[PDB]
Design a protein around this ligand. Structure first.
Ligand SMILES: NS(=O)(=O)c1ccc(C(=O)Cn2cnc3ccccc32)cc1
Ligand SMILES: [Zn+2]
Length: 260
Protein backbone atom coordinates (compact mmCIF):
# COMPACT_ATOMS: atom_id res chain seq x y z
CA UNK A 1 0.00 0.00 0.00
CA UNK A 2 3.06 2.17 -0.49
CA UNK A 3 1.14 5.27 -1.46
CA UNK A 4 -1.13 7.05 0.84
CA UNK A 5 1.60 7.05 3.45
CA UNK A 6 3.80 10.07 3.92
CA UNK A 7 5.13 12.40 6.62
CA UNK A 8 2.05 14.29 7.83
CA UNK A 9 -0.62 14.55 10.62
CA UNK A 10 -2.94 12.21 8.85
CA UNK A 11 -0.56 9.92 6.93
CA UNK A 12 2.72 10.12 8.85
CA UNK A 13 4.61 7.63 11.00
CA UNK A 14 1.93 7.22 13.61
CA UNK A 15 -0.52 5.95 10.99
CA UNK A 16 1.80 3.56 9.13
CA UNK A 17 0.93 0.58 11.20
CA UNK A 18 -2.60 0.38 9.74
CA UNK A 19 -1.26 -0.48 6.24
CA UNK A 20 2.00 -2.00 7.50
CA UNK A 21 1.44 -3.78 10.80
CA UNK A 22 5.17 -4.71 11.10
CA UNK A 23 5.49 -1.03 12.13
CA UNK A 24 4.92 -2.32 15.67
CA UNK A 25 7.35 -5.29 15.20
CA UNK A 26 10.29 -6.49 17.17
CA UNK A 27 13.16 -4.99 15.19
CA UNK A 28 11.98 -1.61 13.92
CA UNK A 29 14.22 1.32 12.98
CA UNK A 30 15.44 3.90 13.71
CA UNK A 31 16.40 3.75 17.39
CA UNK A 32 18.03 5.98 19.92
CA UNK A 33 21.71 4.92 20.35
CA UNK A 34 22.43 5.06 24.05
CA UNK A 35 26.22 5.41 23.87
CA UNK A 36 26.79 4.32 27.43
CA UNK A 37 24.92 1.05 27.04
CA UNK A 38 26.22 0.15 23.58
CA UNK A 39 28.74 -2.64 24.05
CA UNK A 40 32.25 -2.42 22.57
CA UNK A 41 32.65 -5.67 20.63
CA UNK A 42 36.29 -6.55 19.94
CA UNK A 43 35.09 -9.29 17.46
CA UNK A 44 33.69 -6.51 15.10
CA UNK A 45 35.96 -5.80 12.10
CA UNK A 46 36.79 -2.57 10.39
CA UNK A 47 34.13 -1.61 7.93
CA UNK A 48 35.27 -2.09 4.30
CA UNK A 49 33.72 0.46 2.02
CA UNK A 50 34.86 0.02 -1.58
CA UNK A 51 33.31 2.68 -3.73
CA UNK A 52 36.11 3.27 -6.31
CA UNK A 53 34.08 1.77 -9.17
CA UNK A 54 30.64 3.10 -8.20
CA UNK A 55 28.56 4.09 -11.24
CA UNK A 56 25.72 6.40 -10.45
CA UNK A 57 23.10 6.61 -13.07
CA UNK A 58 20.28 8.81 -12.05
CA UNK A 59 18.62 10.94 -9.30
CA UNK A 60 15.03 10.69 -8.58
CA UNK A 61 12.35 12.56 -6.53
CA UNK A 62 10.28 9.72 -5.36
CA UNK A 63 7.97 11.99 -3.43
CA UNK A 64 9.35 11.13 0.05
CA UNK A 65 13.02 11.95 -0.54
CA UNK A 66 15.37 11.89 -3.46
CA UNK A 67 17.33 8.77 -4.41
CA UNK A 68 20.81 8.78 -6.17
CA UNK A 69 20.75 5.35 -7.99
CA UNK A 70 23.60 3.17 -8.92
CA UNK A 71 24.11 0.46 -11.47
CA UNK A 72 24.25 -2.58 -9.28
CA UNK A 73 24.41 -5.13 -12.20
CA UNK A 74 28.20 -5.81 -11.55
CA UNK A 75 30.46 -6.26 -8.66
CA UNK A 76 31.33 -2.58 -8.11
CA UNK A 77 30.53 -0.54 -4.99
CA UNK A 78 30.61 -2.94 -2.09
CA UNK A 79 30.26 -2.84 1.69
CA UNK A 80 31.74 -5.74 3.64
CA UNK A 81 33.48 -6.41 6.90
CA UNK A 82 32.24 -4.61 9.92
CA UNK A 83 29.51 -6.81 11.38
CA UNK A 84 28.64 -8.30 7.97
CA UNK A 85 29.09 -11.82 6.59
CA UNK A 86 29.57 -11.70 2.84
CA UNK A 87 29.27 -8.70 0.49
CA UNK A 88 26.61 -6.09 -0.02
CA UNK A 89 26.26 -4.01 -3.18
CA UNK A 90 25.30 -0.33 -3.23
CA UNK A 91 21.94 0.31 -4.96
CA UNK A 92 21.01 3.86 -3.87
CA UNK A 93 21.48 6.60 -1.36
CA UNK A 94 19.07 9.15 0.05
CA UNK A 95 18.68 11.50 3.00
CA UNK A 96 16.19 12.36 5.71
CA UNK A 97 16.11 15.96 6.97
CA UNK A 98 14.23 18.52 9.01
CA UNK A 99 12.39 21.78 8.65
CA UNK A 100 14.95 23.23 11.09
CA UNK A 101 18.57 22.44 11.85
CA UNK A 102 17.57 20.95 15.23
CA UNK A 103 15.85 17.92 13.80
CA UNK A 104 15.97 15.68 10.77
CA UNK A 105 17.93 12.55 11.67
CA UNK A 106 16.20 9.21 12.15
CA UNK A 107 18.72 7.68 14.53
CA UNK A 108 19.52 9.72 17.60
CA UNK A 109 22.63 9.58 19.83
CA UNK A 110 21.79 9.95 23.57
CA UNK A 111 18.60 11.62 22.28
CA UNK A 112 20.56 14.13 20.13
CA UNK A 113 18.93 14.81 16.77
CA UNK A 114 21.13 15.78 13.86
CA UNK A 115 20.03 18.09 11.03
CA UNK A 116 19.88 15.17 8.56
CA UNK A 117 20.93 11.58 7.98
CA UNK A 118 22.36 9.96 4.85
CA UNK A 119 21.48 6.30 4.11
CA UNK A 120 23.66 4.29 1.70
CA UNK A 121 21.58 1.21 0.92
CA UNK A 122 23.24 -2.09 0.01
CA UNK A 123 21.86 -5.57 -0.69
CA UNK A 124 23.42 -8.94 0.12
CA UNK A 125 24.74 -10.52 -3.09
CA UNK A 126 23.85 -13.99 -1.80
CA UNK A 127 20.18 -13.14 -2.65
CA UNK A 128 20.82 -12.09 -6.27
CA UNK A 129 18.90 -8.79 -6.36
CA UNK A 130 17.37 -6.19 -4.08
CA UNK A 131 13.78 -7.39 -4.36
CA UNK A 132 14.67 -10.87 -3.05
CA UNK A 133 17.15 -9.48 -0.50
CA UNK A 134 14.46 -7.41 1.32
CA UNK A 135 12.59 -10.60 2.08
CA UNK A 136 15.48 -11.89 4.18
CA UNK A 137 16.57 -10.97 7.74
CA UNK A 138 20.17 -10.37 6.52
CA UNK A 139 19.17 -8.96 3.15
CA UNK A 140 20.29 -5.33 3.47
CA UNK A 141 23.06 -3.30 5.05
CA UNK A 142 22.35 0.41 5.42
CA UNK A 143 25.24 2.69 6.23
CA UNK A 144 23.90 5.74 8.11
CA UNK A 145 25.85 8.97 8.37
CA UNK A 146 24.71 12.02 10.39
CA UNK A 147 24.82 15.55 8.96
CA UNK A 148 25.39 18.65 11.07
CA UNK A 149 25.26 22.25 9.77
CA UNK A 150 28.60 24.02 9.63
CA UNK A 151 31.24 23.94 6.90
CA UNK A 152 30.05 22.93 3.41
CA UNK A 153 30.63 19.37 2.21
CA UNK A 154 32.24 19.89 -1.26
CA UNK A 155 31.41 16.37 -2.36
CA UNK A 156 27.75 17.10 -1.79
CA UNK A 157 27.43 20.12 -4.03
CA UNK A 158 26.84 18.15 -7.29
CA UNK A 159 23.76 16.64 -5.60
CA UNK A 160 22.49 20.00 -4.33
CA UNK A 161 22.87 21.67 -7.67
CA UNK A 162 20.69 19.14 -9.53
CA UNK A 163 17.77 19.40 -7.08
CA UNK A 164 16.07 22.26 -8.82
CA UNK A 165 15.61 19.84 -11.82
CA UNK A 166 13.80 17.29 -9.73
CA UNK A 167 11.80 19.67 -7.59
CA UNK A 168 8.68 17.70 -7.75
CA UNK A 169 7.56 14.08 -7.26
CA UNK A 170 8.30 11.86 -10.15
CA UNK A 171 11.14 14.01 -11.71
CA UNK A 172 14.49 12.29 -12.57
CA UNK A 173 17.83 13.43 -14.09
CA UNK A 174 20.91 11.75 -15.46
CA UNK A 175 23.22 11.76 -12.68
CA UNK A 176 26.30 9.96 -13.79
CA UNK A 177 29.84 9.97 -12.38
CA UNK A 178 28.84 10.91 -8.85
CA UNK A 179 31.43 9.63 -6.39
CA UNK A 180 29.83 8.73 -2.99
CA UNK A 181 33.33 8.63 -1.35
CA UNK A 182 32.94 12.38 -1.11
CA UNK A 183 30.09 11.95 1.42
CA UNK A 184 32.09 9.91 3.97
CA UNK A 185 33.58 11.25 7.21
CA UNK A 186 37.17 10.60 8.10
CA UNK A 187 36.49 7.83 10.63
CA UNK A 188 34.63 4.61 9.98
CA UNK A 189 33.99 3.92 13.69
CA UNK A 190 30.37 2.71 14.01
CA UNK A 191 27.50 1.33 15.98
CA UNK A 192 25.51 -1.65 14.65
CA UNK A 193 22.21 -3.36 15.38
CA UNK A 194 19.52 -5.45 13.55
CA UNK A 195 16.58 -3.38 12.32
CA UNK A 196 14.30 -2.46 9.52
CA UNK A 197 13.55 -0.16 6.65
CA UNK A 198 12.51 3.20 8.09
CA UNK A 199 9.75 3.74 5.48
CA UNK A 200 6.97 1.44 4.36
CA UNK A 201 7.07 -1.46 3.80
CA UNK A 202 9.12 -1.34 7.08
CA UNK A 203 10.61 -4.82 6.38
CA UNK A 204 12.86 -6.26 9.08
CA UNK A 205 15.74 -6.99 6.71
CA UNK A 206 18.44 -4.50 7.65
CA UNK A 207 21.78 -4.68 9.42
CA UNK A 208 22.22 -1.02 10.43
CA UNK A 209 25.77 0.42 10.53
CA UNK A 210 25.65 4.00 11.90
CA UNK A 211 28.91 5.99 11.81
CA UNK A 212 29.82 7.93 14.90
CA UNK A 213 31.45 10.86 13.08
CA UNK A 214 29.03 13.20 11.37
CA UNK A 215 29.75 15.05 8.17
CA UNK A 216 29.33 18.84 8.04
CA UNK A 217 27.18 20.45 5.41
CA UNK A 218 26.48 24.16 5.03
CA UNK A 219 23.27 25.95 5.89
CA UNK A 220 22.95 26.76 2.20
CA UNK A 221 23.23 23.05 1.18
CA UNK A 222 20.50 21.92 3.60
CA UNK A 223 18.31 24.88 2.67
CA UNK A 224 18.34 23.54 -0.92
CA UNK A 225 17.10 20.11 0.34
CA UNK A 226 14.22 21.98 1.98
CA UNK A 227 13.13 23.59 -1.36
CA UNK A 228 12.21 20.19 -2.74
CA UNK A 229 8.60 19.33 -2.89
CA UNK A 230 6.56 16.28 -1.78
CA UNK A 231 3.82 17.10 -4.37
CA UNK A 232 4.00 16.57 -8.22
CA UNK A 233 4.20 19.31 -10.81
CA UNK A 234 1.04 21.41 -11.02
CA UNK A 235 -0.08 20.56 -7.53
CA UNK A 236 -0.13 22.84 -4.38
CA UNK A 237 3.24 23.20 -2.79
CA UNK A 238 4.16 21.03 0.23
CA UNK A 239 7.81 21.49 1.05
CA UNK A 240 9.81 18.23 1.43
CA UNK A 241 10.83 18.64 5.08
CA UNK A 242 10.67 16.47 8.16
CA UNK A 243 10.81 13.24 6.13
CA UNK A 244 12.11 11.26 9.16
CA UNK A 245 10.64 8.51 11.30
CA UNK A 246 11.13 8.98 15.05
CA UNK A 247 13.05 6.50 17.22
CA UNK A 248 11.25 3.17 17.82
CA UNK A 249 11.39 0.81 20.78
CA UNK A 250 14.66 -1.07 21.08
CA UNK A 251 12.84 -4.20 22.46
CA UNK A 252 15.08 -7.18 22.64
CA UNK A 253 18.17 -5.72 20.91
CA UNK A 254 21.77 -4.89 21.70
CA UNK A 255 23.63 -2.08 19.94
CA UNK A 256 27.32 -2.90 19.48
CA UNK A 257 30.17 -0.41 19.08
CA UNK A 258 33.24 -0.99 16.89
CA UNK A 259 35.28 1.38 19.10
CA UNK A 260 36.38 2.18 22.67
N1 LIG B 1 15.37 4.65 5.03
S1 LIG B 1 15.97 3.20 4.70
O1 LIG B 1 17.34 3.30 4.35
O2 LIG B 1 15.61 2.26 5.76
C1 LIG B 1 15.13 2.59 3.28
C2 LIG B 1 15.83 1.96 2.26
C3 LIG B 1 15.21 1.50 1.10
C4 LIG B 1 13.83 1.65 1.02
C5 LIG B 1 13.16 1.13 -0.19
O3 LIG B 1 13.80 0.54 -1.07
C6 LIG B 1 11.66 1.06 -0.08
N2 LIG B 1 11.16 0.41 -1.31
C7 LIG B 1 10.93 0.88 -2.55
N3 LIG B 1 10.47 -0.10 -3.38
C8 LIG B 1 10.55 -1.24 -2.65
C9 LIG B 1 10.28 -2.57 -3.05
C10 LIG B 1 10.46 -3.55 -2.08
C11 LIG B 1 10.85 -3.21 -0.80
C12 LIG B 1 11.15 -1.89 -0.47
C13 LIG B 1 11.00 -0.94 -1.40
C14 LIG B 1 13.10 2.20 2.07
C15 LIG B 1 13.73 2.66 3.21
ZN1 LIG C 1 16.51 6.19 4.80
Amino acid sequence: MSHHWGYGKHNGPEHWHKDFPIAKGERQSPVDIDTHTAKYDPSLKPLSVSYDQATSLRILNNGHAFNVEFDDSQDKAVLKGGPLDGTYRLIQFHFHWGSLDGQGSEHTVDKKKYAAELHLVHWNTKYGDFGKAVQQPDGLAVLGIFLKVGSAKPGLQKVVDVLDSIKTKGKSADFTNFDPRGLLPESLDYWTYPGSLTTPPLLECVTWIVLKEPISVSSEQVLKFRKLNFNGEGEPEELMVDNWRPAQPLKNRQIKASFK
